[PDB]
Amino acid sequence: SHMKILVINGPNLNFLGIREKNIYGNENYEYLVNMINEYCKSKNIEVECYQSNHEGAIIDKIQEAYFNGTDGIVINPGAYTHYSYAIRDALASVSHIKKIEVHISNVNEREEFRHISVTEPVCNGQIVGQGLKGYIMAIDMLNS
Amino acid sequence: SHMKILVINGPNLNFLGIREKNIYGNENYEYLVNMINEYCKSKNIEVECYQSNHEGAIIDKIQEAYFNGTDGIVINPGAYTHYSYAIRDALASVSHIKKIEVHISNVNEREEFRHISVTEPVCNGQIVGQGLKGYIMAIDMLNS
Amino acid sequence: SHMKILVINGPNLNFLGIREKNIYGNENYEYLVNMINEYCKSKNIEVECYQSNHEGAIIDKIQEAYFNGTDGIVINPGAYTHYSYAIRDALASVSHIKKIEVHISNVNEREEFRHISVTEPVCNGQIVGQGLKGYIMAIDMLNS
């Protein structure tokens, strides 16, 4: 491992592929985790993929990254993107971990509330509406 | 059981009756659960009543309804009605489960923030300010 | 004990001192807990200091204060100050426990979202931008 990355997916993203196929595509959460894992293996990057529906469990996981040698975070906060100032403050508290925000869907084409990101101002980049390949694009930003 | 229903109550609604009697009435959470249970028994409806203060535990419970043959959901999200886009997205993710939103109090007579429901647009009906009998009215909408 | 107090700190405040030193100062969460503990001991006040990143765990802890003889609550909700109507409703549900809101930083000098407190209207006083000594000032309001 030249680099250690944590990928966080927020609430509901464990239901990728099996539900709302017209918004987030046909490929499921297991596909996404395995695609990430295999890409990172090919680049000699150590990766952990983590998902939770709990705001507090996401914060706890971000705090643990401060103590375990994490270099970078890829995060899709899901619906928490649009209101969780607590997750924003958790990201700000790990100022020397690089962070990339990812959204699968084109959020600017959906409900007005999805246009707001309270997390983006404390991150180091954002990828929107590129589908599951947005996670690979984020890893490459971290690895560059 | 011709039909299986899940009733979800959100944060603070376990303190019904013992607190804020002038807003939500004199009858407690135990009364509400037993009233639901007994009504459903009389109509040959299988019902589970669930309460949590945790946003993430409510989402987890909604996800479990996708796999256990639930037909309908009655939900009072409590204060999460006014801001939890994560609970809205959980309800949207179970598109073939019918959903009815319930509020005990007349929310339109209270603080301005209580006028907003982020969950109502993904439900199949809403009952407001009818007191505890609003839950029975919701079950009858599901059973019709 | 002439009086029993619960001090609640919300998300991220366990990272006091080690992170964001220019915003919240150089002294850490362990320092704050011990300073509180020792002050209360000197005044014959029984105190418990509690922290969690979980909104639902904070609500659960507030509910438990209704049954264990708590007289007063000092609360710094952290980022939840700016949006958690569920924590506001938990505080309102314990109407005979006195409550003081504390913020370490001068929130009126920071991002616009930090100017909003959804919890302050159901409390009995607020202390802003006095640093860690704001917690001692809150205990003295409760003890007066």
Side-chain angles (χ1 to χ4, degrees), chain A residues 2-144, chain B residues 2-144, chain C residues 2-144:
Chain A
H2 75 277
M3 198 176 42
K4 181 179 184 183
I5 295 180
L6 169 66
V7 176
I8 298 168
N9 278 288
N12 304 295
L13 284 152
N14 61 320
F15 271 23
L16 266 174
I18 59 168
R19 315 300 313 151
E20 295 180 60
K21 289 183 167 56
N22 70 307
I23 296 153
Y24 299 94
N26 299 319
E27 293 319 331
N28 63 29
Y29 179 71
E30 178 192 352
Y31 174 94
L32 171 64
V33 172
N34 182 67
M35 185 211 306
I36 289 167
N37 284 347
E38 287 306 283
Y39 186 72
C40 288
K41 187 183 276 171
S42 83
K43 305 290 167 140
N44 194 32
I45 295 165
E46 177 182 349
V47 68
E48 175 182 355
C49 294
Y50 174 81
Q51 188 278 327
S52 181
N53 300 323
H54 304 239
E55 183 180 25
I58 293 158
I59 297 163
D60 294 338
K61 191 75 182 169
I62 294 164
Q63 296 191 323
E64 287 157 11
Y66 185 62
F67 298 106
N68 71 358
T70 301
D71 297 311
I73 292 168
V74 181
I75 182 165
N76 183 347
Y80 295 144
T81 304
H82 316 309
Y83 65 106
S84 181
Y85 292 111
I87 291 167
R88 172 205 184 110
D89 278 3
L91 294 172
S93 77
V94 289
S95 59
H96 280 71
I97 302 184
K98 300 171 169 186
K99 297 144 222 137
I100 311 295
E101 185 165 314
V102 177
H103 305 289
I104 300 169
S105 75
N106 187 347
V107 293
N108 289 327
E109 275 175 342
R110 301 184 63 197
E111 304 97 315
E112 306 289 2
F113 74 80
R114 304 198 194 275
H115 287 251
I116 299 166
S117 172
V118 305
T119 51
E120 177 280 327
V122 299
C123 293
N124 303 109
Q126 185 186 24
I127 302 158
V128 174
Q130 301 302 311
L132 299 194
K133 88 183 164 292
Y135 293 86
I136 306 305
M137 295 171 55
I139 287 151
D140 290 336
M141 293 186 66
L142 288 178
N143 196 35
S144 79
Chain B
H2 75 277
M3 198 176 42
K4 181 179 184 183
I5 295 180
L6 169 66
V7 176
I8 298 168
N9 278 288
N12 304 295
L13 284 152
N14 61 320
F15 271 23
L16 266 174
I18 59 168
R19 315 300 313 151
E20 295 180 60
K21 289 183 167 56
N22 70 307
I23 296 153
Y24 299 94
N26 299 319
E27 293 319 331
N28 63 29
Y29 179 71
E30 178 192 352
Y31 174 94
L32 171 64
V33 172
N34 182 67
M35 185 211 306
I36 289 167
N37 284 347
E38 287 306 283
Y39 186 72
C40 288
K41 187 183 276 171
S42 83
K43 305 290 167 140
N44 194 32
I45 295 165
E46 177 182 349
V47 68
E48 175 182 355
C49 294
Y50 174 81
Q51 188 278 327
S52 181
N53 300 323
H54 304 239
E55 183 180 25
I58 293 158
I59 297 163
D60 294 338
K61 191 75 182 169
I62 294 164
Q63 296 191 323
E64 287 157 11
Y66 185 62
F67 298 106
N68 71 358
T70 301
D71 297 311
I73 292 168
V74 181
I75 182 165
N76 183 347
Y80 295 144
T81 304
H82 316 309
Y83 65 106
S84 181
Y85 292 111
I87 291 167
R88 172 205 184 110
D89 278 3
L91 294 172
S93 77
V94 289
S95 59
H96 280 71
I97 302 184
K98 300 171 169 186
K99 297 144 222 137
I100 311 295
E101 185 165 314
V102 177
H103 305 289
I104 300 169
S105 75
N106 187 347
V107 293
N108 289 327
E109 275 175 342
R110 301 184 63 197
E111 304 97 315
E112 306 289 2
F113 74 80
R114 304 198 194 275
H115 287 251
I116 299 166
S117 172
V118 305
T119 51
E120 177 280 327
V122 299
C123 293
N124 303 109
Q126 185 186 24
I127 302 158
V128 174
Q130 301 302 311
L132 299 194
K133 88 183 164 292
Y135 293 86
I136 306 305
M137 295 171 55
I139 287 151
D140 290 336
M141 293 186 66
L142 288 178
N143 196 35
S144 79
Chain C
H2 75 277
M3 198 176 42
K4 181 179 184 183
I5 295 180
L6 169 66
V7 176
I8 298 168
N9 278 288
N12 304 295
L13 284 152
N14 61 320
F15 271 23
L16 266 174
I18 59 168
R19 315 300 313 151
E20 295 180 60
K21 289 183 167 56
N22 70 307
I23 296 153
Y24 299 94
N26 299 319
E27 293 319 331
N28 63 29
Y29 179 71
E30 178 192 352
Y31 174 94
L32 171 64
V33 172
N34 182 67
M35 185 211 306
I36 289 167
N37 284 347
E38 287 306 283
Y39 186 72
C40 288
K41 187 183 276 171
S42 83
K43 305 290 167 140
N44 194 32
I45 295 165
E46 177 182 349
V47 68
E48 175 182 355
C49 294
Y50 174 81
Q51 188 278 327
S52 181
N53 300 323
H54 304 239
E55 183 180 25
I58 293 158
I59 297 163
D60 294 338
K61 191 75 182 169
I62 294 164
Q63 296 191 323
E64 287 157 11
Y66 185 62
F67 298 106
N68 71 358
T70 301
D71 297 311
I73 292 168
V74 181
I75 182 165
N76 183 347
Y80 295 144
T81 304
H82 316 309
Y83 65 106
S84 181
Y85 292 111
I87 291 167
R88 172 205 184 110
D89 278 3
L91 294 172
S93 77
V94 289
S95 59
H96 280 71
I97 302 184
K98 300 171 169 186
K99 297 144 222 137
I100 311 295
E101 185 165 314
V102 177
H103 305 289
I104 300 169
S105 75
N106 187 347
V107 293
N108 289 327
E109 275 175 342
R110 301 184 63 197
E111 304 97 315
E112 306 289 2
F113 74 80
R114 304 198 194 275
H115 287 251
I116 299 166
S117 172
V118 305
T119 51
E120 177 280 327
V122 299
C123 293
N124 303 109
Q126 185 186 24
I127 302 158
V128 174
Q130 301 302 311
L132 299 194
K133 88 183 164 292
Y135 293 86
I136 306 305
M137 295 171 55
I139 287 151
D140 290 336
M141 293 186 66
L142 288 178
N143 196 35
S144 79

